[PDB]
Amino acid sequence: SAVQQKLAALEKSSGGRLGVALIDTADNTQVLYRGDERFPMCSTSKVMAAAAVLKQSETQKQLLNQPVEIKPADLVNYNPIAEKHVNGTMTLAELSAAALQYSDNTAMNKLIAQLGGPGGVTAFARAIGDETFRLDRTEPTLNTAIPGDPRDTTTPRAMAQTLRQLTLGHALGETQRAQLVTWLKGNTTGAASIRAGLPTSWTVGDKTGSGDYGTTNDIAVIWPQGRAPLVLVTYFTQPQQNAESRRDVLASAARIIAEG
Numbered sequence: 001s002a003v004q005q006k007l008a009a010l011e012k013s014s015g016g017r018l019g020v021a022l023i024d025t026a027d028n029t030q031v032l033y034r035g036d037e038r039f040p041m042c043s044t045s046k047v048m049a050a051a052a053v054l055k056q057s058e059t060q061k062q063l064l065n066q067p068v069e070i071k072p073a074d075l076v077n078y079n080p081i082a083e084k085h086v087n088g089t090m091t092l093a094e095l096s097a098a099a100l101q102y103s104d105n106t107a108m109n110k111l112i113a114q115l116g117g118p119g120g121v122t123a124f125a126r127a128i129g130d131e132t133f134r135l136d137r138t139e140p141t142l143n144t145a146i147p148g149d150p151r152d153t154t155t156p157r158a159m160a161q162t163l164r165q166l167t168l169g170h171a172l173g174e175t176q177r178a179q180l181v182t183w184l185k186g187n188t189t190g191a192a193s194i195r196a197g198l199p200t201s202w203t204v205g206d207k208t209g210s211g212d213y214g215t216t217n218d219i220a221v222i223w224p225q226g227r228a229p230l231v232l233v234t235y236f237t238q239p240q241q242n243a244e245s246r247r248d249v250l251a252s253a254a255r256i257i258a259e260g
Contacts, residue, residue, distance in 0.1 A: 006256045007033045014249045016214065019235040021156035022257050023164050026228035030157070031257065038132075038153040039235035040145035042209030043103045044217045045121070045135055045152065049111040050096040050183065051166050052124035054176040056114075057092075064093035064179075068114075074106050077140045082106035093179075100183045100207060105139035112138055125162065128171040132158035143211030145237055159219055160233045167205070167221045168229060181205055184221060192247040193218035194232055197254030201225050214243025218250045232257060 011018040011033075020033040057063040067089035070082050081098035082090065083106075090098070090107075092114065099107035115121050118135040125133035135142065136151035143152075154162075165171040167181050184205025193216070195204045206220035215237040222230040234250040 001031075003031055003256060003260050004033055006259075007253060010249065010252050010256060014236070014238075014246060016236050016238040016243075016246065016249070018249065018253065019156040019233070020253050020257070021160035021231075021233045023160050023231040024228065025164070025168060025230065030160070031260070032157055035157040036155050038150060038155055039217070039237060040143070040149075040211055040213070040215050041133075041135075041152055041154055041159075041235075042143045042145065042211035042215055042217055043105075043108075044159065044207050044209035044219045044235075045133075045142065046099040046103065046108050046111075046209075047163065047166070047180075047184075047207045047219065048125055048133060048135065049108055049115065049121050050100050051172060051176075051180060052115050052121055053092055053096055053111055054172055054180060055124060055127075058173045058176060064096070065091050067091055068095060068110050070106065070110075074109065076105045076109065079104050079106040082110075097183055097186075101187050101189075103189050103208065108139050118142075128162065128165055130154075130158055130162045133162065143209075143215070145211040145213040145215040147213065147237075147239070156233045156235055159235075160231050163219055163221060163233065164231045168231070181221070190218060190220070193250040194220045194222075194234060194254040196247070196251035197256075198222065198258055199224075208247075210245050213241055214238035214245060216245045216247055216250060218247075220254075 022031040095107040098104035209217035
């Protein structure tokens with residue numbers, strides 16, 4: 001199609017590997033580019049950890065208010081929110097918000113611990129029908145993004161379908177789904193990625209991710225004005241281990257998709 005020609009040209013100009021999945025919920029059509037190739041998820045995996053904890057709270061109604069102690073030993077490489085609460089507590093709701101809206105890595109590791117390890121996050125993916133997602137490591141090593149390494153990867157198609165189910169579908173209860181949507185809409189890290197390629201009137205909830213090999217990711221639910229929402233996943237990774245992040249590529253991919 002026309003969009004796939006332009007995405008391939010974008011990819012060629014960028015020097016990396018680009019994966020795109022769009023789901024238009026108006027007619028359940030999909031637009032895929034390398035939709036079935038694995039990409040390192042990096043921090044986009046935090047959506048699955050948060051959703052898994054939300055799913056637990058459908059039975060444990062008070063779970064999100066449970067205080068979790070933040071100790072100096074818990075802090076890893078990037079903890080913008082958790083660092084504000086060292087030797088204090090944060091609730092699981094606060095940790096989920098910090099993981100999603102600030103990409104706090106300590107928050108993610110606490111969510112993983114709550115689920116019983118990376119295997120517990122992966123279990124939740126399987127439970128909602130995602131057989132592709134795999135979380136193998138904790139923060140920060142899940143971001144190594146080594147070419148060919150299947151650990152901590154998913155495919156664009158799988159992540160788009162799962163993000164659709166979590167936010168627009170009914171994989172979560174109604175209160176949990178609304179909470180997830182609210183968190184995603186309040187993301188603070190996404191201004192230069194998918195959002196930058198879309199009309200300013202459209203409301204976006206997204207989760208970015210970045211890692212080694214210049215890995216630059218963004219997954220988003222998009223509510224266009226007077227139009228059915230869209231789910232857009234953009235994964236991008238590069239051949240050089242020290243390559244710089246390329247958020248502009250995600251913005252350009254979104255712009256190409258939005259032209260259609």
